[PDB]
């Protein structure tokens with residue numbers, strides 16, 4: 001009961017809703033949940049779904065990971081630490097997905113949405129792999145607005161957890177594409193103070209973090225002991241006036257509990 005108590009205590013201390021799934025990667029069955037059917041802004045966590053959609057196109061040969069995209073300084077939106085450094089040489093679709101997931105590059109995310117036909121086509125992709133709940137409507141950075149009770153650019157903990165399992169382990173993507181997606185998430189360099197902060201030596205983690213307006217914060221992860229993922233964790237919160245630091249520490253403490261009671 002310890003981990004669900006942490007989530008409830010986090011709600012108390014953040015003054016906001018927290019959504020939680022712990023999913024068995026093998027069976028795909030929910031082990032624990034909190035507000036599993038409630039909507040939360042995906043924020044940057046959507047970039048894993050976007051690169052899923054890109055890889056599905058690469059498998060079908062409508063995209064090539066080696067294909068180079070040139071863009072202009074005028075295409076650059078807030079938080080573009082990789083893409084602002086490749087204005088003369090451009091970047092391959094592979095490099096863009098690397099930027100989107102490992103660095104949460106916002107311009108990378110928009111360039112990739114253009115490659116698939118935008119938010120409506122990411123939603124179509126999720127619909128057609130059996131996720132009729134998750135929806136993307138807007139581009140970076142507007143999809144992070146987190147307007148209370150707005151369903152635009154939202155998922156549920158349940159839908160995100162099951163969708164992430166299908167992308168990483170389901171029949172949808174080729175083995176090569178599943179390996180490349182989980183590899184990008186393993187190489188995440190912007191989620192240090194979250195689940196990674198509670199991870200013991202020898203454990204595997206592949207994750208993607210997110211932050212938005214109105215105290216929005218979240219993480220999706222495949223993790224497990226002995227260097228192999230065996231569970232999917234989804235944590236979302238929205239509405240809190242809490243600092244980025246407190247929100248990070250609350251997610252870390254939920255992580256510490258689920259690892260403690262593995």
Ligand SMILES: *C(=O)N1C[C@H](NOS(=O)(=O)O)CC[C@H]1C(N)=O
Pocket residue numbers: 042043044045079103104105106140141144190191209210211212
């Ligand atoms: C993702 O939600 N975002 C991109 C960037 N990195 O934050 S993250 O590592 O939690 O992904 C900055 C904030 C945010 C955004 N508003 O786009």
